[PDB]
């Protein structure tokens, strides 16, 4: 799995394929506990370590009804060089897998300013490893409504909005 990470981490954009959706959703019905873990990924070179988890069958207020998406800060080798708490804006997306030439795909996208007072968005070392995000990201009804599920697979995107710092032209 160190290669899945090497292939992701660098520029704050994870794209995560979750395969065997139908099976995985059936097990999440049998174990409500069951969560999928993305590869860890870094917001920039020597940046924050982040991970994404998905509950195909929902968690908290969306248990049973929704796909639930969370993002989390992990202990990073470079934590002692970064500002805390984590405060970059995160943008979750579930990708509609329709050809973008043949039809501008309708993606489900949400953006949130992290909660400064969440035990996890502060520097690892302070006293939870839980996560933050959307328990009602998309409905079991709506997830089937387009190409969000194509080829028994789903695509979750997490983008750390870090804009370009340039001088005036």
């Amino acid at each position: 799995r160190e290669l899945e990470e090497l292939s992701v981490g660098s520029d704050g954009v994870l794209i995560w394929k979750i395969g065997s959706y139908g099976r995985r959703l059936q097990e999440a019905k049998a174990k409500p506990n069951l969560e999928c873990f993305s590869p860890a990924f870094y917001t920039h070179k020597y940046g924050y370590k982040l991970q994404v988890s998905a509950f195909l069958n929902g968690n908290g207020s969306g248990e049973g009804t929704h796909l639930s998406l969370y993002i989390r800060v992990l202990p990073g080798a470079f934590d002692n060089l970064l500002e805390w708490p984590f405060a970059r804006r995160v943008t979750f997306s579930l990708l509609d897998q329709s050809d973008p030439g043949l039809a501008k795909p309708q993606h489900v996208t949400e953006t949130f300013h992290p909660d400064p007072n969440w035990k996890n968005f502060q520097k690892p070392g302070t006293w939870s490893s839980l996560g933050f995000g959307y328990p009602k990201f998309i409905s079991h009804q709506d997830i089937r409504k387009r190409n969000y599920v194509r080829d028994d697979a789903v695509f979750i995107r997490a983008a750390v909005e870090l804009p370009r710092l340039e001088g005036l032209v």
Binding site: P32, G60, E63, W118, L130, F132, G133
Partner: peptide, 10 residues
């Protein structure tokens, strides 16, 4: 069922 959920926004 039950859950130790992680925090959220609407």
């Amino acid at each position: 069922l039950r859950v130790a959920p992680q925090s959220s926004e609407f």
